A paper describes a structure:
Mitochondrial proteins CHCHD10 and CHCHD2 are mutated in rare cases of heritable FTD, ALS and PD and aggregate in tissues affected by these diseases. Structures of D10 and D2 fibrils assembled in vitro from the low complexity N-terminal domains of each protein show that their core comprises the most highly conserved region between the two proteins. For D10 and D2, the central conserved VAV motif forms a beta-strand that is associated with the protofilament interface in all the structures we have observed, suggesting that it may be a critical element in fibril formation and may be expected to appear in ex vivo structures as well.
Using cryo-EM, we observed several distinct D10-NT fibril polymorphs (see Methods section on Cryo-EM sample preparation and data collection) and determined three different structures. WT D10-NT polymorph-3, solved to 2.63 Å resolution, contains four identical PFs with yet a different fold (PF3) arranged as two helically symmetric dimers situated around a central pseudo-2-fold helical symmetry axis. PF3 is comprised of residues T50–G76 and contains only two beta strands consisting of T51–V57 and A68–V70, with an extensive turn between them. However, in the PF2 and PF3 D10-NT folds, some of the sequence variation sites are positioned within the PF fold, suggesting that these D10-NT folds may not be compatible with the D2 sequence. Interestingly, residue S59 is a small sidechain that is packed inside the PF interior in all three wildtype (WT) D10-NT structures, while residues V57 and G58 are found either in the PF interior or at PF packing interfaces in all three D10-NT structures.
Author numbering:
A (entry chain Z), B (entry chain h), C (entry chain d), D (entry chain J), E (entry chain B), F (entry chain F), ...: 50 to 76
The structure:
């Protein structure tokens, strides 16, 4: 299984308690 | 299984308790 | 299993209690 | 299993209690 | 299992209690 | 198992109680 | 198991109670 | 098991109570 | 087991109570 | 004048001869 | 003058000769 | 004049002849 | 004039002849 | 004039003929 | 004029003919 | 004029004909 | 004029014909 | 004019025809 | 099967992601 | 099967990600 | 199977990630 | 199978990550 | 199988990560 | 299988990480 | 299998990490 | 198997980490 | 197996860490 | 005065007594 | 005065008594 | 006055009594 | 006056009584 | 006056009574 | 006046009565 | 006046009555 | 006046009545 | 006047009536 991604949060505000995963590939 | 994606949050406001995954590919 | 990703937080605000993973590949 | 990634936090604000992993590849 | 990554924190603010791992490859 | 990474902290602020590991490869 | 990495702290601020490991390879 | 790394602290600020290991290779 | 590393502290500030090991290779 | 933005390219394909500016604020 | 925006290209195809600006604020 | 931004290229493909500026603030 | 930004290239492909500037602030 | 930024290239591919500037602040 | 930045190249591939400047502050 | 930066090259590949400057501050 | 920086090359590959300057402060 | 820096080459590969200057302060 | 051809791209602009084949002769 | 051809790209602009084959003759 | 060809790139601009084959003759 | 060809890159710009083959003749 | 070719790169710019083969003749 | 070729790099710029083979003839 | 070739690098610039083989003839 | 070749490097610049083989003939 | 070759380095610059073999003939 | 052009002759037939100029710019 | 051009003759036939100039720039 | 060009003759046929100039720049 | 060029003759046929000049720059 | 060029003859046929000049720069 | 060039003859055929000059710089 | 060049003859055929000059610099 | 060059004859065939000068610098 | 050069004849065939001068510097 192949995964490809981009995860971008905010540009000015904060990031609190957040799961920013670019790509997930389970097995 | 192949996955491709882009996940973008806000540009000014915050991101709180959010799961921003670019791509998920389970097995 | 292959994973590729980019995870970017904020540009001005802080990052608090956040899991910024570029790519995850379980086994 | 292969993993590739980039994890970038903030540019101005702090990073507090955060797990910034560029790439994870379980076995 | 192969892992490759880059983990970058802040550029101005501090880094407190954070796990900045460039790449993790479990066995 | 092979691991490759880069871990960079802040450029102006301090680094306090932080685990900056360039690459981890368990056995 | 092979490990390769670079761990860089701050450029202006201090480093306090931090584990800066370039590469870890368990057995 | 092979390990290779570079660990660099600050350039202006101090280093206090910190474990700067270039490379660790357990057995 | 083979280990190779470089550990560099500060360039202006002091180094206090710090374990600067270039490379560790346990047996 | 204040500007805030996020510019994200592709997730799989390349980026060729492109001006990806997150935010522009002329004077 | 204030500007806020998000510009996202493709998710699979390439980006060629394109001006992806998140936000522009002239003076 | 204040500028804040994030510019992210591709996640798998290359970046060729591209001007990736996070934020521009002219004077 | 203040500028803040993040510029991230690819995660797998190369970067050729590209100007990756995190933030530009002219005078 | 103040500038703050982060510039990150690739994680697997090379970087050829590229100007990776974290922050530029002209006078 | 004040400048602060982080410039990181590749993690696996080479760096050829590239100008990696962490921060530039002209006068 | 003040400058602060971090410039990191590759972690596995070579560095050829490259200008890796942590911070530049002209006068 | 004040300059502060860190310049780190590769961790495994060579460094050929490269100008690795930690900080430059012209007059 | 004040300069402070750290310049570190490779950890395994050679250094050939390279100018590794920790800090330069012209007059 | 015989094939003869001439394929010419642009004279001023670039060529991006293009398959310029002078002649193709399948079997 | 016989093939004959000429493939010419640009005269001023670049060539990016392009397959310039003068002649192809499959079997 | 016989193949004959000429493949010419640019005259001023660069050539990035391009497959310039004068002639291909499969079997 | 016979192959004959000429592959010419640029005259002023660089050649990055390109496969310049004068002639290929598979078997 | 017979192969004949000429592969010429640039005349002013560099050649980076490129496979310049005059002629290839597989078996 | 017979191979004949000429591979010429640059005339002014450098050659970095490049495979310049005049002729290859596999068996 | 017979091979004949000429491989020429640069005339002014350097040659770094390059495999300049005049002719290769596998068995 | 017969091999014949000429491998010439630079005329002014250096040769670093390069494999200049005039002719290779495997068995 | 027969091999014949000429390997010539630079005429002005140095030769560092280079394998200059006139001809190699394995068995 | 600026000139840019491409001049291509035949692909199969000969070229006899012909002035093939890519670009002419008189003074 | 600036000139840029590409002049390509035939691919199969001969070139007899022909002036193939890539670019001419008189003074 | 500046000139840049590429002049390529035939790929199979001969070149007889021909003036193949890559670039001419009179004074 | 500046001149830059590439002049390439045939790939299979001969070159007889021909003036192959890469670049000419009169005074 | 500056001149830069590459002049390449044939790859299989002979060179008879030919003036192959890489670059000419009159005074 | 500066001159730089590369002149390469044939790879298989002979060179008879030919003036192969790499670079000429008159005075 | 400065001259730099490389002149290479054949790789298999002979060289008869030929003036192979690497660089000429008249006075 | 400065001259630098490399002159290489054949690799298999003879050299008869030939003037192989690496560099000439008249006065 | 300064001269530097390398003159190499054949590797297998003879050298008859030939003037092999590494460097000539007239007065």
């Amino acid at each position: 299984t192949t995964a490809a991604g981009v995860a971008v949060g905010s540009a000015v505000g904060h990031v609190m308690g957040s799961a920013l995963t670019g790509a997930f590939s389970g097995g």
